[PDB]
Ligand binder design. Sequence first.
Ligand code: ADP
Ligand code: ADP
Ligand code: ADP
Ligand code: MG
Ligand code: MG
Lengths: 578, 193, 193, 314, 470, 158, 51
Amino acid sequence: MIQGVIQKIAGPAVIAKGMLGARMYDICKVGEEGLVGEIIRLDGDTAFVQVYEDTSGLKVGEPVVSTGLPLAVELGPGMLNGIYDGIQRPLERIREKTGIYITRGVVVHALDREKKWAWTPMVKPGDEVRGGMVLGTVPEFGFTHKILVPPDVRGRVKEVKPAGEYTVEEPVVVLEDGTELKMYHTWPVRRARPVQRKLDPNTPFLTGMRILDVLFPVAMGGTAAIPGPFGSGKTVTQQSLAKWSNADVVVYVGCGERGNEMTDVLVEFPELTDPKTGGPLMHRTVLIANTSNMPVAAREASIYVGVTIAEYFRDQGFSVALMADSTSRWAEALREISSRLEEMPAEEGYPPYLAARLAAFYERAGKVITLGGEEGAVTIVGAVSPPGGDMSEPVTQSTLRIVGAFWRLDASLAFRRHFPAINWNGSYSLFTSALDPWYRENVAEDYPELRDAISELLQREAGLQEIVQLVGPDALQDAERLVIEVGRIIREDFLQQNAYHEVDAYCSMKKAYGIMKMILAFYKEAEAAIKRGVSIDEILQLPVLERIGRARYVSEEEFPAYFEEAMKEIQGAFKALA
Amino acid sequence: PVQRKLDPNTPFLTGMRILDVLFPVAMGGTAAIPGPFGSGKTVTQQSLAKWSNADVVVYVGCGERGNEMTDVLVEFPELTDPKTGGPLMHRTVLIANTSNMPVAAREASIYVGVTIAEYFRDQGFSVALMADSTSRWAEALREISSRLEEMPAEEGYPPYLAARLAAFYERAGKVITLGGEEGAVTIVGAVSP
Amino acid sequence: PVQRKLDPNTPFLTGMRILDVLFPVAMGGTAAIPGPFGSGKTVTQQSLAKWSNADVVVYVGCGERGNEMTDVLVEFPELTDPKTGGPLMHRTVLIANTSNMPVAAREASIYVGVTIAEYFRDQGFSVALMADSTSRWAEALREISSRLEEMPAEEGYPPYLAARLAAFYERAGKVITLGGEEGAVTIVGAVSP
Amino acid sequence: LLKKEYTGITYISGPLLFVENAKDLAYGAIVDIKDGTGRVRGGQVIEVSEEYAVIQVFEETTGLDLATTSVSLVEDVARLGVSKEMLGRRFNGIGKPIDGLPPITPEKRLPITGLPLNPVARRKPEQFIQTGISTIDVMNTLVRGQKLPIFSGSGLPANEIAAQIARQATVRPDLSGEGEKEEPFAVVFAAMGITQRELSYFIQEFERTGALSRSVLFLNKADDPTIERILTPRMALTVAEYLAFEHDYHVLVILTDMTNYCEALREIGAAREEIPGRRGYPGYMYTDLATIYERAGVVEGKKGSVTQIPILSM
Amino acid sequence: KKEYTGITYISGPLLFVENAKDLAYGAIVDIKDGTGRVRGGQVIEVSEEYAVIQVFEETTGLDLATTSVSLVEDVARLGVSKEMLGRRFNGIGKPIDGLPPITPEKRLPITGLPLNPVARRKPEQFIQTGISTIDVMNTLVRGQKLPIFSGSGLPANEIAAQIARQATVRPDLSGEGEKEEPFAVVFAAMGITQRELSYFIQEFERTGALSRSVLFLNKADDPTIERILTPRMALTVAEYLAFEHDYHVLVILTDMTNYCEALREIGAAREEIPGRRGYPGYMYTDLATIYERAGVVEGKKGSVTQIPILSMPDDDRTHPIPDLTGYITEGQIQLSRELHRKGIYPPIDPLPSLSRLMNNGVGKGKTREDHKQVSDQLYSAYANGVDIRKLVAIIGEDALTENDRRYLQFADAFERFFINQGQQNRSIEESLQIAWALLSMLPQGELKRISKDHIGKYYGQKLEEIWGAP
Amino acid sequence: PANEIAAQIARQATVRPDLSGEGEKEEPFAVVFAAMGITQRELSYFIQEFERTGALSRSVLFLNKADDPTIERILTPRMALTVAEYLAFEHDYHVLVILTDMTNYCEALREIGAAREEIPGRRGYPGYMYTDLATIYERAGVVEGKKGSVTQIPILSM
Amino acid sequence: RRVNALEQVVIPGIRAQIRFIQQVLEQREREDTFRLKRIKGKIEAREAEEE
Ligand SMILES: Nc1ncnc2c1ncn2[C@@H]1O[C@H](COP(=O)(O)OP(=O)(O)O)[C@@H](O)[C@H]1O
Ligand SMILES: Nc1ncnc2c1ncn2[C@@H]1O[C@H](COP(=O)(O)OP(=O)(O)O)[C@@H](O)[C@H]1O
Ligand SMILES: Nc1ncnc2c1ncn2[C@@H]1O[C@H](COP(=O)(O)OP(=O)(O)O)[C@@H](O)[C@H]1O
Ligand SMILES: [Mg+2]
Ligand SMILES: [Mg+2]
């Protein structure tokens, strides 16, 4: 490859000479120390390379060697149960050979080069193989990892290795033109992986939160955003989605995060268990962790590594969910990189191409038909942290133009310790109508025409706030005092959920449906009793109001008996009323 | 050149009650009409062209819509000159440079219009000059300065912007011509902030 | 050079109730009085020159009007020293550099004044130094920097502006002189934003 | 005809590259850029001189090098091949079909920048259009040859109103006294910066009522190169002008979102280090927008008409 | 040994030396002139033809004929030892107290390596600072970064000195009594004046607090590069003591605003285009390499804790320096101007203050088990009372309800006794006792946040225990 | 109406020897008038106002109209103040100086400053504008041992 | 009446002024950045006048 020498050092900017033939945006190794960087400007015989690490100690005349490839990730067996930084360096294997400090110039491989895998072929000599097809399978924990021919390779199969133990470096399939196919291939993180055809999402993405998958649901293959002020509940909700969701593979991206908070994820997660299979939770997760003191170039490309890995797992027929934590701290690194390149800003210091990059990141989601003919889906949920809790910030304005759902957290509800702090007026979703055919088959026939009744009840309560603020609740007539009480019951027994509780942390769909049925039955019976002529004071004393309050903490398998008992008890109590 | 300039002492009758009564403008004066979009600058200027008592009307469409020029071209031969009885188009000169025409020609159109108005002044007539927008002329100057790599003063405008506007508006007034006859020119300019 | 810096434990009496009571300054302290034009900086500093209890007063007129220097030159010989009984001008040194005098001399006057004030400190006196405007010093530094073609900082000032101001206020304090006596210098500087 | 290649690349940085010996490239020409792997990129000459010519690239400059890259001339001015068979087709906003059907056979090739209409050649708009909406038709009526934008918010249903207008608009000659007779009516729909959900919604809505048989669709997605967003409305206006003023159609052009066009223009202009305007947008926004909006109207002596309904979100 | 005499340009703080390609980037050099004086400098740019050197101090007396430059060290290193405890340094390791220099046990680069995120562990033990509003409601945990936000006239220096003088750990409260815990304090002051220098010296030396502290003092008239290098050396010493001798250290950085303005000056002197409001574009990255060196590491017994201090330029929390600080640190303690003007010290405002990591350090087995509920109840009650205190001025006290009068009296007594502690040193048990004494003013049963066991155990104490013993 | 106020001040100004106790009568003020970028409408008013009060026999006028070149405005205040200083301190006159618009002078200064690419101050004006304005205003006052005096009434639009 | 007047008149009036001042300040900052870019570009060309 192309080799040169250093001509000028000034900060991170290094000018090399003799680099005629070097290509744009390649990865170069600078000096004898082995520091890495990117070529950003070519001029005659010279090249402008920008070094990631600290350049103190470099001398003029040290060699510069170009790798000939842009920023790329290694896709193959062995990515699950792994912890990476923003440029795919395994942190666990760095610690085993370096200690508590990350020394500059350390060299490690993303995929383990000395672990045996159980190869099993699915092709024979003479087969005609197109890009994106399947060569064989490899067992990996609870899954079966499929070896895929890279998207740009086609030909005829010459020879296939027999079954046995092999490493990722062994060429298992050799084509007739001399091409050797191994168990892994590299892909540029800034190139979208091709597909056959995109599809409309039609199945829900179950989150385990009662408000989320009922009032503002997100479809499998959709996008969402969760902005909020400081201490509103972003991180807890993201970790809850990681813990309890029904996606096959979860990719968690911390794109620049507080160190003592990244420690919580790095410590607590190995202790947890898989909701579906009961095994370790980390057997289905890929973790990408960056702290604030990591190199800025690794922080900026962290959300592209994650989406590329998610697209790779999508091409094998899985369903992948991607959690991006604090994309505002990714936009900070983007702004810093733009500032180092001397670019004219737009809005509050951001580069004018911010809305292009945000669009290029969110648009990779969606349910597709893979090149092999299988279905796959990627779901993206990103969290935004505005500097002052204002939604006019440019990142929020650029995000809300392209997301399919929008959950807005409120500081007023967080002050009253109402968790989750989702504002049910400013929020919206666009997947309800498409998800309606799925709900009436798998949950209940009445569900889409039962959720809107509760939405109507919540809307009627909001219109009475101008009167309750003027005159106290005890001066209202019973016809609206009843809906005030029902609104309180809804807000405190259905919408509210405790993520630290043992049984309240997760809620299935049928449990929520039963709670809604109980609430609406109470509303109907109380309205009828008011129409008889009874006073509302005797209604609010009924013990069944505590039974609805205990519906959150009842166990998931104990619930079918409790629901039947409550539905009998409420009719028995309201029949005996005057 | 002229012999002497005179003090304006006769009104410029426009035909609008609020402009003729509350805020009059003389036969040698200058006026500016700023306003946002949809405020009514073009309607006001075309009413001034239709109904004023000036002998010759010069209209300059510096960087405006083409439909306004088409409307003026079509509907004016069907009207009647208030003080002569002939067609209204017989007293009108139009200079049109629409918005999608070349930018550099916006600067020349203002000078062409004011030179024609000065020429008709020297024959003893009273001329009213209407400029549809001077902000477009300012934008043309800004673009030319941007190609010259000059340092801008404020909002990107070249520092000599005020000199050009001061020199343009100073052409107006009531004068004694070199031939001994009397003439006057009024300038009404629209501004689009 | 000095021998040892001391602690501030003696108030600087200015004669104004608000400054002496609510916002006191010690004998070796530093104070800043910013404000817009026509707010009262010059009158306050001249009142401090007239009525304070310092032994020697040094006045630096950096880049201001000459009429105020004439007023000080005329009015002061008729006054009485509050602690000596003689003329008030016998304890005052004036360094004047008006606004129409050359720009580069504005930087030199501040250093000359502070050096003279330090010299009178070494004899065992307490000296009060008043700088009429330190913003003109920064403006002069900006003016010189335009000829040097350097890269400016915020608002066009040279990047080393903050070092000069820090080194100027650092000279104030109560010390033990090299001869064993005790002296002090207090600085009051006006800022014109 | 033969082709010429220039291999004197001297400087690459950002979106620009310099060609040394290219003294015969016309200003504003269209070139194609070939790297060592055979991938071809497009570009436009924005400045020419004796020493070198400046070419900006339509997409990423990743993979280029000075030793092996070569620049070839395509055509002196950008041209689009138009034909009457384009009705019912879909294009990617650059001129290539994305419906899977074979490409069209050009009747004529026309410049996409167009030419200014002579104000003497125009005539007054005088015929109304039934939009099917009570608030528009009665109080803010639409005339053939008018340009009437819709000002929308972030959450307001602008796309639904656009689809309803495209489905339900018609021209009524029986009211005008001309007599009940056929009028050739067509719809040119240009969407730029839309997401996949809105693209699917528009496709399904156009197919549902069978309006696709009389419509030409130019579609541009949010992950596409930003140059295609600049070139998208000019293709639609060229096609509409050709139809209206050669085959006497009554066309209706809908520009789905001009806000994305303005962002794409700000991104392009700031990359060339030019002095910004009111809020970072370039100072020549007014001229650039006037080159698009002013292409509608009616022409004296001809039957066709062009009507524009831009849509933007404040 | 080698000396370069090819000076070609001197202007401001920079000078150019030709044929100096042997100098490494960032190397430290010394400049010698015709009078024999030796100055310091740093290489900021190396090329084939010349190198650029930024000079410490002024350039008076230099000339292009006689000046020569020699090399001192390839990278900036500091000699560290356990004998640094009880010493004062000028910001580049030169002693200023007059004692002989320390012999180095090691020489370490002042720019440290980043910590591996997988080697950290969760902070779970607290520090008793001796201040009620910090220990009870905003508890500081070993390994936390908890800055203090102050203003122009507010006494941040006094609070810093008091925290440095009073801080200790409580091994008896943890487990079965625990064992010996070595403790140390590292103090770094950037851009302070002579008055603050004298105050800090006389405060540390008058009570024996110097025997466990290392002080890095940098004056306002010192060179700016000294101010840049001041906090990194303090962090180097803190990391050495914590992770090679098992010490529990506490680092106090006196003013980060001065550091940011020095960074702005240095960046503008090297012809770099700034970012928002004139500050350098890499300020977020540069601050992150200082804050993130604190923490606690698996398999190690020591810990590093940081308390940065910064002054908001106009009490503006939207300024870049406080805004980017909150992106990296785990909370904030905010000083109040109106509490300062009302004669209350220390003027810590409990409403805007927040500590992210309080829940891990408090609780059963590390402190008393009623900590969290008491803190929450105090927060809620004070937040209720502060608005009644304003409503009274319009509607009059006799028109309020009874509970409103209770809350008003509680909000007065809270500011009177709990916050205004003066120079007193309070243990955690004393602060909890005072907090329970204040809660007894409120009627029993109004304490919705506290469980019944703690109410039955601790309610009913009189306020006279501190009223009659102030 | 700043021009009418200036003309009224110039018409009505007088000292009061009887109140001051000097007892010495005075000759009327000599007026030095400097116009920078003035229009014809204001200039025709000023000329008629000076004609009606008979003050043209004691006046010196420097006129730079709005259609005149811009860069000539740098010289005019200096010429006017040189003549005023000579008359006041060489022939014991009492001179009143009126400068019509300093905004035009500042615009003329900004044009040249932006041509040479100086380091600007606020709103694009050159950084030495304080010094340049100081050399104009500070030419007034009273000199010890001399009878004459210079009084300035600049006019400027905000 | 007073509550409604404060809620619906004064607060948006203050907020619009804040939004205007922020944009003016940002525009001035952008102009300063452009000027600094020109100054740096001019300085770089002066040094390389004779290679
Ligand atoms: N679902 C929930 N259940 C219980 N507590 C919650 C819930 N959501 C948020 N909280 C509380 O709100 C706080 C918000 O903290 P966190 O979400 O980590 O930071 P941020 O909201 O700034 O991302 C947490 O300390 C937690 O105690
Ligand atoms: N005097 C008027 N009488 C009636 N309508 C008017 C009048 N002035 C303006 N308008 C209305 O203003 C609209 C357009 O104003 P216009 O002159 O185009 O303003 P601008 O030129 O600033 O865009 C016209 O449709 C017209 O209905
Ligand atoms: N203590 C005071 N008593 C009376 N008048 C004062 C006092 N302070 C200021 N002034 C008036 O305020 C004006 C401010 O003058 P000066 O201080 O010279 O301006 P600046 O503050 O801009 O330097 C003076 O004309 C003076 O008459
Ligand atoms: Mg108009
Ligand atoms: Mg003054």
